[PDB]
């Protein structure tokens, strides 16, 4: 359909034009709002007082990585070379080679933490359900020699909290 805005004409009669000459010359407008709508300061401030208080999130949040393990640990990753092949940024790097018993596992697993674009494509391709984006924004170290991760940085970083992780998926896994 339509509408027309800013289409109006002044009335042009001496009952009006005072009302527009009691405005220009006496400032009866322009004190209407910012004489007032500004104050209106008397509302409670809204601030999350940071070092202590913190704000909301959701169980589907994304962040620092992990590699779980079952009960008594198997290093849940089977090195099926997938979370590697859907990765848009191509951070992941994986090198398998048959472990002594003959069950296969990894050797090098490196997520670069600069390239990773935080998809949620590597949480959703792993069929054996290993690699999982943690909900901890712990980060920010002082040397780029660092953020590159090896395998045996990840596991700890994913065994430091599994009380966080293992209780999110069981909220979220019923939807997908």
């Amino acid at each position: 359909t339509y509408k027309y805005v800013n289409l109006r004409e002044p009335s042009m009669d001496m009952k009006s034009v005072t009302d527009r000459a009691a405005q220009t010359l006496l400032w009866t407008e322009l004190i209407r709002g910012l004489g007032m709508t500004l104050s209106y300061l008397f509302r409670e401030p809204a601030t999350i007082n940071y070092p202590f208080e913190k704000g909301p999130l959701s169980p589907r949040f994304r962040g620092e990585h992990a590699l779980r393990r079952y009960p008594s640990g198997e290093e849940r990753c089977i090195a099926c070379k997938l979370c590697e092949a859907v990765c848009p940024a191509q951070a992941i790097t994986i090198e398998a080679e048959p472990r002594a018993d003959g069950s296969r596992r990894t050797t090098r697993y490196d997520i670069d933490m600069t390239k990773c674009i935080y998809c949620g494509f590597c949480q959703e391709a792993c069929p054996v359900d290993a690699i999982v984006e943690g909900p901890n924004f712990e980060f920010s170290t002082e040397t780029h020699e660092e953020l590159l991760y090896n395998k045996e940085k990840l596991l700890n970083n994913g065994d430091k909290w599994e009380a966080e992780i293992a209780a999110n998926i069981q909220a979220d896994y019923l939807y997908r």
Partner: protein, 269 residues
Amino acid sequence: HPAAHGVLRLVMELSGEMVRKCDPHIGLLHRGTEKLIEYKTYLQALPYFDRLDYVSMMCNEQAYSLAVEKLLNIQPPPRAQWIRVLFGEITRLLNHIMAVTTHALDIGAMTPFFWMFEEREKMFEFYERVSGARMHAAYVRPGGVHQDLPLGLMDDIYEFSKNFSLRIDELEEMLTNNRIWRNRTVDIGIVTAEDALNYGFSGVMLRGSGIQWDLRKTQPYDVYDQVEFDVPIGSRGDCYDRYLCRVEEMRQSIRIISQCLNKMPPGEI
């Protein structure tokens, strides 16, 4: 400072006062995109459509995911689309909260920014609860929506919407008829011509200028046809009648979000 969340360097030869010349240099953000999307598959290369602009998120990808379902001869199931109207028409509340304000931070005011972004936050939750992340969120796909939304949000959309038409009434008494602003914008940068078409402009700086056309009701998207709305229009081609679309275009949306909470049929995604 006047970069508008971006980077440009423009050069003008002004005549002593009047500009009469300008010739900007864009190309500071190029990044090399369309050479890099021949090298990625279809579902792997989606986000580089979300990261294109910073403000509208689910409205991009609504324009990719509709350019793929075609070549596939496939439509989403009914509960797909009626999401893509609720988020699709909730981010028109973002770029219209920004382009009335972070435009008018150049005009120098303070509060119409620090007054609003209290609120543009209460929306960013609703990207985080539905899927994951703060802004860029990859949700729409070639197949309709990714995964269903939690038990909730329909008491956090409704409760939030019925509060909102008031805040948009604190950007009105603070702007429209405030003189020092009316005088900063009227009859300024008027293109009324049929060059304003000849250049092939898109929506607003059209619809606010007279010539009357919109791609929401002349073409269907994804069931967009079944809800009623009116397309505000402007009088004279200056700026302050391209502003006045972007208020009366934030007071149309709350009609649709209010009209689209009643209809969502159960079904797959």
